[PDB]
Nucleic acid binder design. Sequence first.
RNA 1: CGGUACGAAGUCGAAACAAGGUAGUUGAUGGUGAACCAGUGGCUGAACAAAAAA
RNA 2: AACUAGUCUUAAACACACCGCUCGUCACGUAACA
RNA 3: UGAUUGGUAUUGCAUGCCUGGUGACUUA
RNA 4: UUCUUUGCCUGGGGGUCGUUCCGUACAGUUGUAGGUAAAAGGUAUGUUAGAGACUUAGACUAGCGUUGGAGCACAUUGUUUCAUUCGAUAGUCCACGCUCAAUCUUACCAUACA
RNA 5: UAAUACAGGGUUGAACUGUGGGUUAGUUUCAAUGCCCAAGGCAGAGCACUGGAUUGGAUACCCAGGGAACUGUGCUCCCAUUAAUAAGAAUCA
RNA 6: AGAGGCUUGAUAGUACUACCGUAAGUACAUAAUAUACAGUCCCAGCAGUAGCGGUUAAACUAUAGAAGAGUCGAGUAUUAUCCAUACAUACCAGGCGUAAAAAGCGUUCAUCCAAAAAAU
RNA 7: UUUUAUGAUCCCAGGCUGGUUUAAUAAGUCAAAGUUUAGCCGGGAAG
RNA 8: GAAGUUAUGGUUUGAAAAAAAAA
RNA 9: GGCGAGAAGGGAAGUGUGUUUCAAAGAA
RNA 10: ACAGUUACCGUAGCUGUAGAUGAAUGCUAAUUAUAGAGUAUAUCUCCUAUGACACUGCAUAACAUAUAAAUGCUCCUUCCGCCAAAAAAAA
Lengths: 36, 199, 62, 177, 240, 164
Amino acid sequence: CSDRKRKILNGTEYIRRKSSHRGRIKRGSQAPAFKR
Amino acid sequence: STRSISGRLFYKRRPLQVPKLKPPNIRSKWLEGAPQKKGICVKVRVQTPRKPNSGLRKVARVRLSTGRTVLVYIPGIGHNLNVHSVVLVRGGRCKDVPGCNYKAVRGVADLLPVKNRERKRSKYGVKLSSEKKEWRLQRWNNKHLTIEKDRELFNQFRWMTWRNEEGEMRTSPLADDEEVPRHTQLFNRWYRLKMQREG
Amino acid sequence: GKGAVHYTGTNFRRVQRLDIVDRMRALVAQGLVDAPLWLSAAERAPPMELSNLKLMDRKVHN
Amino acid sequence: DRLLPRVFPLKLPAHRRVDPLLREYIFFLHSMDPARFSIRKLGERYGLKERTVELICREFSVAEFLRRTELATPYTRRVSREKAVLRMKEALFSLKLGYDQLGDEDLDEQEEHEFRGFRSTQDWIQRQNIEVEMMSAFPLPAKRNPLPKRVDVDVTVHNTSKLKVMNWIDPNDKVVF
Amino acid sequence: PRGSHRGGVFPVSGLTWGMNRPYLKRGLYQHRRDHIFTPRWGTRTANFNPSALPDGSTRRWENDAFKAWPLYGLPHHVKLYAVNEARYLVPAARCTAGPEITQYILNQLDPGGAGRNCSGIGRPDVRLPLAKPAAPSSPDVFDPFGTPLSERSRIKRLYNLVCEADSWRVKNAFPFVDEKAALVRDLPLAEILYCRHTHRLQSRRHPFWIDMGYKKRIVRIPYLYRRRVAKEEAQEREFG
Amino acid sequence: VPRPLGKGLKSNLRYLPLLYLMGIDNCRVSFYGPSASARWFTRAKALKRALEQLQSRRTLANATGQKYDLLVAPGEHWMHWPDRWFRPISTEYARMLERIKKKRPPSYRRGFRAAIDEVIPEEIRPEFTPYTWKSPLQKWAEELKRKRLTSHNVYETEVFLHPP
RNA sequence: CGGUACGAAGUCGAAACAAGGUAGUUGAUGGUGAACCAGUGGCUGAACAAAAAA
RNA sequence: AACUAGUCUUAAACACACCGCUCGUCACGUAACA
RNA sequence: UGAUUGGUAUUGCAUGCCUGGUGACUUA
RNA sequence: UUCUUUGCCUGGGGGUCGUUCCGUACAGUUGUAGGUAAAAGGUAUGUUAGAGACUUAGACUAGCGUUGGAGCACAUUGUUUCAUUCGAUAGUCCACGCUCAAUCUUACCAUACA
RNA sequence: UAAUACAGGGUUGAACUGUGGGUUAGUUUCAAUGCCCAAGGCAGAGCACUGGAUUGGAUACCCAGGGAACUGUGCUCCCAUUAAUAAGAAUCA
RNA sequence: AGAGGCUUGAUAGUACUACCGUAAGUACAUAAUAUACAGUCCCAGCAGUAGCGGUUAAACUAUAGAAGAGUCGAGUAUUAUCCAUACAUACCAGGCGUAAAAAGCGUUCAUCCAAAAAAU
RNA sequence: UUUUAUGAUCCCAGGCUGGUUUAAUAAGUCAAAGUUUAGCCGGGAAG
RNA sequence: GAAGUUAUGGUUUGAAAAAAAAA
RNA sequence: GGCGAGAAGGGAAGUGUGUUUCAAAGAA
RNA sequence: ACAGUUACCGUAGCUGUAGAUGAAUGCUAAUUAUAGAGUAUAUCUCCUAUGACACUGCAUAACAUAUAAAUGCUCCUUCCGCCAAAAAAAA
């Protein structure tokens, strides 16, 4: 969470991680969504 | 304090939860656990130290035998390193130069030892010169000095029964123009012993 | 870390109450003070233990 | 006051405190008739210990051998710094108080409660300095006694001018034959 | 360990180093024994003997020698032992419970019995310095023969305490008030390390090199003394 | 940390004087100290809280009602000889008590060594009392020693061996 | 390729810290040489102003 | 109703103390990853 | 009616002495 | 620093065939280079606030007079000269150093003597 | 957040019951706004954008107008993600 | 100096095995040296984080800078390796309001623990 | 029907074990894991 | 000869076979 | 003709190697 | 387990210092001690002793536990050790 939340805050995850939340710039999910 | 070994999987969980600080000597990771590595100077230049310090630091980009290229500081005053020069490189961090974590061993390969150096010679590969060796022996030729208390005591106690180097005896106390004689069996004993042992 | 979170621990101080007779006996024995004149009378009439009697007060519903 | 530089009396051996003439007399008696003038009897008469008498006899015999063979004088035998300092100590002791004319030791020391170093202030087997116990007017359970350690020893069984044979003994071996 | 000391080097005596301190620089200075407590248990002589005959008149005892080489059994020792024996026997003397408890207290005060050496104070056949004389120990039973009571030997523990007390015995104005003074004195490390020897550092240096250092000093110290004295004398001659 | 009785104080020489001021004995004191901005401001509170923990055998024994005996001094704190042992009596009341009480036979094992009464100081010196069994050399040495000790020249401190 | 870290201080503005002169910042967005701006929903890690009772 | 000197309260990322601190594009060389 | 040991050259961002402006100066 | 069980943290910070799975897909991603001796929480003061309140102490106001409009004098600025010496430069420079310069004062310039 | 319909939870009591629990992934019901999709579509207000001003200058703050978004058993959980600083036992009258 | 290596700006208690203030290399010889000095001037250079060097440096270079000073010594220093001294790898022995850290709120499986601990 | 989040299916890297003394009230076995003569083990073939 | 014997690192990318059906 | 002879093996193997706890009879 | 990290307190890292190595590098040594005095000049001194006191690690000198990485080329291995009690030297 320290380095993990730091990556979230600086936005690496925003770019590199798929999101079932979608958005027009973020990567999307083409498979049914489930909590991981 | 034993909240970290709860449950059944403590023996696999807790050993994972530990400090994760950098290794003590990770600054020299490109030596690959070796005391020192040989490298070829790909670039030789002078860099500007970080402020507030000012001046020029002699540095070289060197391609180690491992193939990695690293920045190496050239300790000492003056050097002859050029491009395509082979240098032995050890772990040493020059705080001024950004990213510099290795130094060059003086007197090894094409890096000549520092000139006009007489202190910390073992840290710059300077041998003990013949002049220095001769002086480290001729230095202890003891000098004879008096404080007039020697004169008083000699004229009060010693002149009565005294023997010269040749064995001659004294017949009068010390004059005003005569220095206090040396003790034939105690003065300069160590230096005389060394000279006589040599020959 | 934290500060005064150690209940039943270093939050409280478990130190003895040393009255006049105890403190003066210690001072005289260690020789830091010359024996006062009243010390004999104080020793022969020691002060009572007030903390123990204090612990006997009980809250009562009205 | 623990920081005051106090001066305490210096300790000296009894075999160096007794008078040299008494030493010579003891040496003569022992070297003449070691049976009638036993070490125990000499110590009993002259208020010394058997070890002290033995040391006196050894030292006097060495000195007499050296003197009569003309090997070294009492001031040319090479010795250690500690023994030179001991000689100085006894010299000053004699110059101040004078040599004792009789021994003052005890033949068989007694069981006396005295501080004899930090090792003497604790029960090493129990690993405790304080014996915590309850108050009762009736018998209490006895304490478990220790059992003596069973350690190996070597006992010589046959010695000659060429070979020494000694039996290695293991006190735990049950079948002994 | 090996090699030179890497880190902070402090004098073993506990004295600070500085421009106007006993030591100029950092170091152990274990050879400097003038900064530790070395009692003088011997004698002392002078550089010169004025008398025309070598009678050893300069030789004299050192002050610490009287504590180093004591003498026991002196009259003040005897008097102190007598007073302390009276006070120490007070309990058994004034016990009025019974012979059993009296013997118990006596044994506690001075252990004795078969195979032991005691003072025999409580024995019926030993004389004591009673205040009110009484029968030694009614008319029917006594000792028909003379049989004088034997003397009582001393209590060894108490006598040793009395004798050893000597080692622990310790021997208007210009009204100028001090304002730059300390209210509670001060307790430096040197005051401890001077006399409490077990707190000091044990040397890792070779005794050979210790002896070599002593031999070097014996030859070099006078030269430095003469160097500075010659500087001063040359300056005075130039001024003259 | 406790140390065996006799070793004394152990600590950094920087703080040995502090140990001597505190007056502790037979123990080793170690500081691991804060790594924050302060060094002694909070270390003082830590040391005070440490010193507040120390108890004594007397404190423990009084609090508990049990025995906490130091092996080099057993019974030092709890043993009390009753005052009923040392109750002096006058002559008339002594006669009355001897009349009222019932006698008990004296046991030699427990009764021996009980012939003592009020004592007054007197100087003795039984180290030099001649006896028949003493050997001639022992008698000679003891006589010389007693003469030396009782001499009038004792207590005469003369720094010079060869006096003026 | 786009981005990133070090040295340098050059041009352009003045986005934040005071109500920072339009409160800040956040989720996903739209727009813009640059910091940024706008709407919407969150938070406070924000202010201003602030009741007597008929 | 405004200003200076105070004096008081609040806020502060200022403490060389708002003539403070401080953001970014562009330009400029040495590099790692990609 | 009794003369003298160079520089009014730089450096007030080396200072002494001396000034300007603003602040203070409270006790029993 | 009473006890039970899950979740997470290791200074700051940066870049980044496994699938007989539908493949630019699914699943998965804090971590390796390059920088670093700091970074960041609070309380205590000061300073500031295009923040607020207050005393009404000065400021305003009111009264007596000015100055910016014209002439002269001083200083300063611009110009010029071989030189028109120099300093002072918001308040705290500008009739100031210089409480008085035709000679001298003079420290500026020109000439010729050392 | 009026009434009505259908469901909880909480509180109080009676009965029943009788260690039947505390925590929880290879678990999945729900969950602001935005975005994708679908609906409708001009009550209000309102990105981008247009033009009326201020500014050396503004791509803004101010004004007028405005086809993006504002109601879904869908897709769906990114967050300064919802009653707080995880849940339970113990210590208090 | 019977000998060399390293230090010669501050900073580290220089540990520790027997002794545990119970003594003398105690006195004389025998009293000291370096935040004295010289060369360089944000250069050359040094250093361990901090830092020093701005033309009068106990911080760079120099030890005939003096028979200089501290330590170890036939050796000594640099680099490297670690279970790298309590950068407690935190069981002994760290944390999750504000400084890194409580999952968005919840329902459960397995494990774990509780209530008849130890014994049965 | 058999395995499987107590890690099945399924890649790469590594044979395991012992060594007496061992300072500190840190030891009566060196005390989660650090070794050094050694212990145990490590296919088959003239077809 | 037998019976018991915690896995670790490379960040890892959870179901694998058999059987049934298929042609 | 008879005995002995591995340059004293690190080439295989992860739930393996080894370790710990055991057990092992001819002349029946 | 001590110190340091620019007001103070708390987080948190960082810096020096211990120990186990003994692996590389720098400077440095090595064939280990030939030889055996007396008046070593003075001062002092009842262990009277060339005592204080002051070149002889100076000697029968010593010299230790674990190890032997990778690639290429050339050459070598063929009469291994004992037994004739393997019926031999043989009253």
